[PDB]
């Protein structure tokens, strides 16, 4: 690892500098090096890891969708043959996106998940596992697509079971997990009714638990609750 010679604390420090500089590739490389030191991650350090790769893969996904749309138009009735370049470049971006997903999943499997005992950490990592199998699913088209989808579902489901038993309905990780599992149902698993039912139930149960929270915790939950409301308005 190119980060093997840098102190763990220095990697965390530089990941925070990279975030301030919006250098998310650097941020992700620093946090990969931090994870590979072998120590568990703190709550703040987990957020740095997820934000870094979320932004990296986020830009790859947006570019993939631009290219895939161009590719789909090029294969319509009446479109002039432009050669293999559009497919080639879409495959280039797709392959880089899959490498990032494989890298995150490798970190979760070696060895973040197995050493995660507290609900907040274990649910967090299992959500990540579901997220990055979902991103693999968004671009999957071959003989392993169904197993990729089920790997996302399986990771999300174990996270859901833990979060419902160990976390209050307003916990931001529990809310973000449910939001994304609902998106998985709608966009990946062809289960729009399940996606809608999950978003409603999640929102309503969090609504009924807000009275227990301080002003700061109240603000934290409602931000993600609004995303649940946004998707319901989009979907209904």
């Amino acid at each position: 690892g190119a980060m093997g010679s840098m102190e763990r604390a220095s990697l965390i420090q530089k990941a925070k500098l990279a975030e301030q500089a919006e250098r998310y590739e650097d941020m992700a490389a620093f946090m990969k090096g931090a994870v590979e030191k072998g120590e568990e991650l703190s709550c703040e350090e987990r957020n740095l890891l997820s934000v870094a790769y979320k932004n990296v893969v986020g830009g790859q996904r947006a570019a993939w969708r631009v290219l895939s749309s161009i590719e789909q138009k090029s294969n319509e009735e009446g479109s002039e043959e432009k050669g293999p370049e559009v497919r080639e470049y879409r495959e280039k971006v797709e392959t880089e996106l899959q490498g990032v997903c494989d890298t995150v999943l490798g970190l979760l499997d070696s060895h973040l998940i197995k050493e995660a005992g507290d609900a907040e950490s274990r649910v967090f990592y299992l959500k990540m596992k579901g997220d990055y199998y979902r991103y693999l699913a968004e671009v999957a088209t071959g003989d392993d697509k169904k197993r990729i989808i089920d790997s996302a579902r399986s990771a999300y489901q174990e996270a859901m079971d833990i979060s419902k038993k160990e976390m209050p309905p307003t916990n931001p990780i529990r809310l973000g997990l449910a939001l994304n599992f609902s998106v998985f149902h709608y966009e990946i698993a062809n289960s729009p009714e399940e996606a809608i039912s999950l978003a409603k139930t999640t929102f309503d149960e969090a609504m009924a638990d807000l009275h227990t929270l301080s002003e700061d915790s109240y603000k934290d939950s409602t931000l993600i609750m609004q995303l649940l409301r946004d998707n319901l308005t989009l979907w209904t």
Binding site: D131, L179, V183, L227
Partner: peptide, 6 residues
Amino acid sequence: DKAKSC
């Protein structure tokens, strides 16, 4: 349209 996630 793409749904919101987090």
